[PDB]
Enzyme design. Sequence first.
Site, PDB file in Angstrom:
ATOM      1  CB  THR A  16      34.459  21.260  50.260  1.00 27.33           C
ATOM      2  OG1 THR A  16      33.420  21.284  51.239  1.00 27.33           O
ATOM      3  CG2 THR A  16      34.311  20.003  49.429  1.00 27.33           C
ATOM      4  CG  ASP A  39      63.631  12.734  57.317  1.00 27.91           C
ATOM      5  OD1 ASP A  39      64.267  13.282  58.232  1.00 27.91           O
ATOM      6  OD2 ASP A  39      62.831  13.322  56.553  1.00 27.91           O
ATOM      7  CG  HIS A  69      63.232  16.765  59.604  1.00 26.44           C
ATOM      8  ND1 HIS A  69      63.174  16.077  58.417  1.00 26.44           N
ATOM      9  CD2 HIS A  69      62.760  18.010  59.362  1.00 26.44           C
ATOM     10  CE1 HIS A  69      62.685  16.876  57.486  1.00 26.44           C
ATOM     11  NE2 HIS A  69      62.406  18.070  58.048  1.00 26.44           N
ATOM     12  CG  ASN A 161      61.366  24.619  53.034  1.00 32.77           C
ATOM     13  OD1 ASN A 161      60.365  24.135  52.499  1.00 32.77           O
ATOM     14  ND2 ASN A 161      62.001  23.968  54.004  1.00 32.77           N
ATOM     15  N   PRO A 175      60.689  14.905  36.685  1.00 37.38           N
ATOM     16  CG  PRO A 175      60.793  15.464  34.430  1.00 37.38           C
ATOM     17  CD  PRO A 175      61.637  14.922  35.563  1.00 37.38           C
ATOM     18  CB  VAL A 177      58.874  11.684  41.793  1.00 38.45           C
ATOM     19  CG1 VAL A 177      59.898  10.637  41.372  1.00 38.45           C
ATOM     20  CG2 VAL A 177      59.518  13.050  41.974  1.00 38.45           C
ATOM     21  CG  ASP A 200      53.421  16.529  40.178  1.00 39.08           C
ATOM     22  OD1 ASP A 200      53.110  16.516  38.965  1.00 39.08           O
ATOM     23  OD2 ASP A 200      54.565  16.233  40.610  1.00 39.08           O
ATOM     24  CB  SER A 224      60.144  18.685  55.561  1.00 40.93           C
ATOM     25  OG  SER A 224      61.416  18.835  54.976  1.00 40.93           O
ATOM     26  CG  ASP A 260      39.169  25.890  46.901  1.00 42.77           C
ATOM     27  OD1 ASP A 260      38.207  26.673  46.723  1.00 42.77           O
ATOM     28  OD2 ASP A 260      39.111  24.682  46.614  1.00 42.77           O
TER      29      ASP A 260
END
Length: 279
Positions: A16, A39, A69, A161, A175, A177, A200, A224, A260
């Site tokens: 928390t 990837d 990566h 990014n 929308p 996913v 999301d 990523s 937060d």
Amino acid sequence: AAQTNAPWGLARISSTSPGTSTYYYDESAGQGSCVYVIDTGIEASHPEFEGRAQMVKTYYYSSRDGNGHGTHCAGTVGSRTYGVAKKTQLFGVKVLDDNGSGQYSTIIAGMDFVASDKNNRNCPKGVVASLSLGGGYSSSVNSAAARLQSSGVMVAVAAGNNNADARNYSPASEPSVCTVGASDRYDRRSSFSNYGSVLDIFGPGTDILSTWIGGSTRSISGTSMATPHVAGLAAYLMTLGKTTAASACRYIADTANKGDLSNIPFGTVNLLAYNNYQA
């Protein structure tokens, strides 16, 4: 279970508050679930994967990760030291070359592959896909990501990014996913993270330690790196029976830490991924 001296991002998803260093999780740890990492490939022979990783498909001359990566993303999903879901099975799909680039037609073929290939694997607790890639808006790329979700796979994708609205990037802008932004260890939005109404959830994305090629380790930054924290969390919660592939994105948002984060533009969700584990 408790992992002392964990990477900051694992400690943050089981807390928390910021500023702690132990990761807490139920010992079932994603056993019986599967995660596809789409990837540059996975170095499956790395000791951190303990025999639970394998390459299942490549569109190039080799299935090896010549970049690093894809090995780093797979380590945040399911490695023994650096992963969220420490007993999941990992499946690699190489749609990017060793310079990290790839054509959109190859990326679409890769997403169609996972929707069929899940029927050839043993995943009784459920199936997840982690997409740490993206480019400019494409209706064809968004439709492929929507088909994969519809087929019964929990799809998590990187916001991007560009410090801009994610509405102009694909597959981020689809929308249906789960679109993931990045945060830092002091609960600030990462300076590079995209934002907007299509996001999301946020996950740890600045200075993330994980596996690398050559049997090594390193710390790197980006949306990523945030995406595989959420994919691993989804696999962990499906094993515990708390949710399913179709509603895991909604379940993660409903149970997240709320209000937060700092520097969240008006109109973007202020939600940080959280496992709600009580020792």
